[PDB]
Structure 1
Amino acid sequence: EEQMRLPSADVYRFAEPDSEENIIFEENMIPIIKAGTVIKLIERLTYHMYADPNFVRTFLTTYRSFCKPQELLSLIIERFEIPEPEPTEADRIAIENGDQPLSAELKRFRKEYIQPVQLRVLNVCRHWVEHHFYDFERDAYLLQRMEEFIGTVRGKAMKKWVESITKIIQRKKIAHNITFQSSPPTVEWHISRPGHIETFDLLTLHPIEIARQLTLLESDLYRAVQPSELVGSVWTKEDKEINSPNLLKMIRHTTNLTLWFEKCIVETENLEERVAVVSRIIEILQVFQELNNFNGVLEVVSAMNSSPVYRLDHTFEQIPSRQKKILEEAHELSEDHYKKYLAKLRSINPPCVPFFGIYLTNILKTEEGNPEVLKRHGKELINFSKRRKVAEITGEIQQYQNQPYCLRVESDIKRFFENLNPMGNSMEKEFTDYLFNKSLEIEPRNPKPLPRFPKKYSYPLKSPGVRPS
Structure 2
Amino acid sequence: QMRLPSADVYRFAEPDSEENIIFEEGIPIIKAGTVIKLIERLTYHMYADPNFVRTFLTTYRSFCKPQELLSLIIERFEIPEPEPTEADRIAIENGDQPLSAELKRFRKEYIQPVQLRVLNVCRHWVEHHFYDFERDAYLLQRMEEFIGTVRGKAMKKWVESITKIIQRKKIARDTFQSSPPTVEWHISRPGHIETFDLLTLHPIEIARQLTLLESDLYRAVQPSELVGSVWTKEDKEINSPNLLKMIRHTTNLTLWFEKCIVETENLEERVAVVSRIIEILQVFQELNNFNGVLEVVSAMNSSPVYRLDHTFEQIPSRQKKILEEAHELSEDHYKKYLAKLRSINPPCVPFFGIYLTNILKTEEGNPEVLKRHGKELINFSKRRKVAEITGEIQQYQNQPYCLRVESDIKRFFENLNPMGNSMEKEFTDYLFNKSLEIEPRNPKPLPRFPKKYSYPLKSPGVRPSN
Equivalent positions of 1:376-391 (< 5 A) are 376-391=372-387
Moved more, 214-223 or 70-79: 70-79
In structure 2, the residue corresponding to 1:15 is in which secondary structure?
A: coil
Instruction: Tell me the residue number matched to 1:165.
Output: 162
1:423 aligns with 2:419: yes
Q: Contact between 2:185 and 2:201, CA under 8 Å: does it hold in 1?
A: yes
Cα distance, 1:347 vs. partner?
1.1
Cα distance, 1:174 vs. partner?
2.1
Instruction: Tell me the residue number matched to 1:458.
Output: 454
Deviations 1:416-466 (A, max 9, x none): 111111122222222222212211111111110101112121111111111
Cα distance, 1:350 vs. partner?
0.9
CA–CA distance in structure 1, aligned partners of residues 44 and 217 of structure 2: 37
In structure 1, the residue corresponding to 2:437 is in which secondary structure?
A: helix
Moved more, 83-92 or 186-195: 83-92
CA–CA distance in structure 1, aligned partners of residues 375 and 432 of structure 2: 51
Deviations 1:378-426 (A, max 9, x none): 4321111100000111101111111211111111111111111112222
Distance 1:152 1:229, change over 3 A: same
Equivalenced residue count is: 464
Deviations 1:260-295 (A, max 9, x none): 111111111110111111000001001101111010
CA–CA distance in structure 2, aligned partners of residues 166 and 324 of structure 1: 58
Distance 1:105 1:165, change over 3 A: same
Deviations 1:316-354 (A, max 9, x none): 001000000100111111111111111111111111111
Instruction: Tell me the residue number matched to 1:65.
Output: 62
Equivalent positions of 1:10-21 (< 5 A) are 10-21=8-19
**Considering only aligned residues, what root-mean-square deviation do their CA atoms show, in Å?**
1.9
Cα distance, 1:201 vs. partner?
1.1
Unmatched segments (≥5 aa) in structure 1: none
CA–CA distance in structure 1, aligned partners of residues 120 and 272 of structure 2: 59
Instruction: Tell me the residue number matched to 1:106.
Output: 103
TM-score scaled by structure 2? 0.95
Unmatched segments (≥5 aa) in structure 2: none
Cα distance, 1:194 vs. partner?
1.3
Match of 2:360 among 342, 361, 364: 364
1:93 aligns with 2:90: yes
Deviations 1:48-106 (A, max 9, x none): 01110100110011111111111111111111111112345665455456665533222
In structure 2, the residue corresponding to 1:241 is in which secondary structure?
A: helix
Q: Contact between 1:239 and 1:248, CA under 8 Å: does it hold in 2?
A: no
Distance 1:40 1:363, change over 3 A: same
Distance 1:254 1:230, change over 3 A: same
In structure 2, the residue corresponding to 1:319 is in which secondary structure?
A: coil
CA–CA distance in structure 1, aligned partners of residues 147 and 260 of structure 2: 56
Q: Contact between 1:234 and 1:363, CA under 8 Å: does it hold in 2?
A: no
Q: Contact between 1:291 and 1:352, CA under 8 Å: does it hold in 2?
A: yes
Following superposition, which runs of at least 4 residues in structure 1 exceed 6 angstroms of deviation? none
In structure 2, the residue corresponding to 1:24 is in which secondary structure?
A: strand
CA–CA distance in structure 1, aligned partners of residues 234 and 314 of structure 2: 37
Cα distance, 1:249 vs. partner?
0.6
1:44 aligns with 2:41: yes
1:193 aligns with 2:189: yes
Q: Contact between 2:289 and 2:348, CA under 8 Å: does it hold in 1?
A: yes
Q: Contact between 1:4 and 1:109, CA under 8 Å: does it hold in 2?
A: no
CA–CA distance in structure 2, aligned partners of residues 77 and 242 of structure 1: 26
Q: Contact between 1:187 and 1:408, CA under 8 Å: does it hold in 2?
A: yes
Distance 1:299 1:307, change over 3 A: same
CA–CA distance in structure 2, aligned partners of residues 16 and 89 of structure 1: 26
Distance 1:140 1:234, change over 3 A: closer
CA–CA distance in structure 1, aligned partners of residues 426 and 235 of structure 2: 18
Q: Contact between 1:222 and 1:356, CA under 8 Å: does it hold in 2?
A: yes
Q: Contact between 1:237 and 1:248, CA under 8 Å: does it hold in 2?
A: no
Q: Contact between 2:231 and 2:243, CA under 8 Å: does it hold in 1?
A: no
Q: Contact between 2:287 and 2:348, CA under 8 Å: does it hold in 1?
A: yes
Moved more, 239-248 or 42-51: 239-248
Deviations 1:346-378 (A, max 9, x none): 111111111111111111121223111123344
Cα distance, 1:12 vs. partner?
1.5
CA–CA distance in structure 2, aligned partners of residues 356 and 21 of structure 1: 39
